[PDB]
């Protein structure tokens, strides 16, 4: 995931006394289709669909259509 969730850059800065090295790492947010970040979720992230609230039928009802 480090190859598509974090974007890295390394640069040099020429100053009077010498070179300063700067490293910038950005961890992209999960973006479903829209390019702000990766489309794939993190492999260890498990999302469980919330079950919808059903009502148990008390008596057998037959619906004719």
């Amino acid at each position: 995931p480090v190859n598509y969730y974090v974007d890295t850059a390394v640069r040099h800065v020429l100053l009077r006394q010498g070179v300063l090295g700067i490293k910038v790492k950005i961890m992209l947010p999960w973006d479903p289709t829209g390019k702000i970040g990766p489309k794939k979720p993190l492999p260890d992230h498990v999302s469980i669909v919330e079950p919808k609230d059903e009502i148990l039928p008390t008596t057998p009802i037959s619906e004719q259509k």
Binding site: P43, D44, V46, S47, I48, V49, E50
Partner: protein, 132 residues
């Protein structure tokens, strides 16, 4: 080492607590259920979660589990806990009573009780564990 990580265990616990009705003792049906109701980005992780779900289903089959808490299961559990004997264990024809508690009851004004049977007191005053 086949020790499951917390990812697998928490995922399995949540899946069981949410979809206990759809699950059973079959690994190959449980894994399909998991892949239908959840979003697991890996097949190996899905298989591990389904295996632990099967293990936990077997565990709940013979009692309770400290991690799971199923709302419908608690009603049946307290229904089992609603056992009531035919005759109350506190309803005794004769209950033994020491002379001291008999005197206390007499001072309470309840000295007319009939079920009391005044048993003999102890003889030796040896109720302490020897020191050493």
């Amino acid at each position: 080492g086949r020790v499951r990580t917390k990812t697998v265990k928490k995922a399995a616990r949540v899946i069981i607590e949410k979809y206990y009705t759809r699950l059973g003792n079959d690994f190959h049906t449980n894994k399909r259920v998991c892949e239908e109701i959840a979003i697991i980005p890996s097949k190996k992780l899905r298989n591990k979660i389904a295996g632990y779900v099967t293990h936990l289903m077997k565990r709940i089959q013979r009692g309770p589990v400290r991690g799971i808490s199923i709302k419908l299961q608690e009603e049946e559990r307290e229904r089992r806990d609603n056992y009531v004997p035919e005759v109350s264990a506190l309803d005794q024809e004769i209950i033994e009573v020491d002379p001291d508690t008999k005197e206390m009851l007499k001072l309470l004004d309840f000295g007319s009780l009939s079920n009391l049977q005044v048993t003999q007191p102890t003889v030796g005053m040896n109720f302490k564990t020897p020191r050493g």
